[PDB]
Amino acid sequence: VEERERIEKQLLLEAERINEIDTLAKAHLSNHFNKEVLLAKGYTLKDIMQAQRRELVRKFVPIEQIKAIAKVSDISHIDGEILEQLVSLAKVNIKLR
Amino acid sequence: LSINERITKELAEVEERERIEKQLLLEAERINEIDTLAKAHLSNHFNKEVLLAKGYTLKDIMQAQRRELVRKFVPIEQIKAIAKVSDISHIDGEILEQLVSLAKVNIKLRK
Amino acid sequence: VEERERIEKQLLLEAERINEIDTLAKAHLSNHFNKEVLLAKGYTLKDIMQAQRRELVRKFVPIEQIKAIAKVSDISHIDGEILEQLVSLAKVNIKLR
Amino acid sequence: LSINERITKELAEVEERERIEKQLLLEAERINEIDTLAKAHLSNHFNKEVLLAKGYTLKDIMQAQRRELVRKFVPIEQIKAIAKVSDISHIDGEILEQLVSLAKVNIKLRK
Amino acid sequence: LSINERITKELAEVEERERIEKQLLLEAERINEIDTLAKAHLSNHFNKEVLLAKGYTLKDIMQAQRRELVRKFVPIEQIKAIAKVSDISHIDGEILEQLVSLAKVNIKLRK
Amino acid sequence: LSINERITKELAEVEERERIEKQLLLEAERINEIDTLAKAHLSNHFNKEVLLAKGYTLKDIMQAQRRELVRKFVPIEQIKAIAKVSDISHIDGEILEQLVSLAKVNIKLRK
């Protein structure tokens, strides 16, 4: 049952990450990308989170840094470790902002 | 071995040689970019001649210049974000390539 | 895989040599012998590099050294490490120039 | 032709061997300098003549003279710190060259 | 693979791990010596905390402290004759170990 | 054998003797060129008479004269471009021929 306990630990970790991302995105980007309206438009939870992350990058991380770390100007398909780097860069930019 | 096999082998060999040629051009461009960045933004102590005299491989010279450019231009929080850590002691590689693209971005915005 | 690693090392070495040759040839000879226009005219990369080297010899290395060290006045067919000697002499000439 | 340039490479390698001959000559000069150090700072019993009579190789004579000079001039604290060990009996080599350099410095400052 | 081969492989593995452990302990003691020398003989501005904040590797901190200690204690003639040059900026290594040993005994004789 | 075997043998023997004669003429021209160069550009102490009295082979005389001519005319900026090191004390052959050709060019442009 400790396997399920650790699974629940990881669930709590990603839930906290999602909550933090949503809380900062609501105050930073817009309310058009709210979880409720995105779900109504028909996007899965992970798709909503990654779209919010990409918007956070496009807001805080300027497009030059975007293409610098993402190695491609379009964040449409860079998702993964590069996307995590970019969202941490967005966190850094808002920290220094 | 029929004619279709002969032609496809010949074209595959030609395309492989052309791809190797493109790789040579890309590596030449990388060398030019590293030399220009080292001459423009980094100190004379990190020159290829003195590094080779100290006994470092060419790739080691490239990654050392890249790391110095990242530390000079890329702020430490940006490093903690992209590299996911502060220390660039062993971060050399494609993450370092992203970080040096960031360094060139920083010099473009700094000019 | 270390065989392919050393092959890539040799690729890097020749790429660096091509870089040095190009960075001096563009500023020394002309824009007519640019890599793009030569490729459009239809010359392979090795042919382009050897033609540029021969032009470098014809610009810096004097004809007496061409007909004495390389034994032929025409650099059209002398290619090899004799061409290496000629381009080294051209490097010395441009260094003293 | 290809033969001309390959023979050029051959004689360039001969030229490198000539440089090896020069560095051999430089090593011989270092040998005579160590001999002068041994005469100036060590007992007559450690002379090359008596050591050869006892039957020791020339390199053995040089390393014995170097070890004795290090023990005489370089204090044992530096000796221990440098060799990472107190004993010099198995420290012949580049570390020994560094130690005899330190001994030369010690006699220079002593004078 | 016979019994003797098994025993020799096991013994070699054990000895290798023991040597690695000894190397770790030696690095520990080296970190000690750098820390104590920096605290006792060098200014607060060269502390590991502030140097790491400025963004220097641990090895860079160690060699910088060593070079500063050598300049502070070891005289310039001694430097010029040990390292064969006045500048210590490119003498990190075994010769740096020699200069820092000379400083270590210099402070002992100063006391 | 049919007569065609000698139609090639008879001609081969004559051609071999003709090539040997041409080689003898080439050697004579080489000796004449060495004599002229030694008389014109090198000191009297390097004359064939005094060198033979000191007991050196004719080929040794030729290579010594060539080496002295190379050192006198060809500067190090080409000696290290062809032989790759400055001195040619033990170096002669194809690089020596290239260097004496370069020295002939050098004296021609000097005049």
TrEMBL record, chains A, C:
It comes from the Bacteria. This is Uncharacterized protein. It comes from Borreliella burgdorferi (strain ATCC 35210 / DSM 4680 / CIP 102532 / B31). The chain holds residues 66 to 162 of 230 of the full protein.
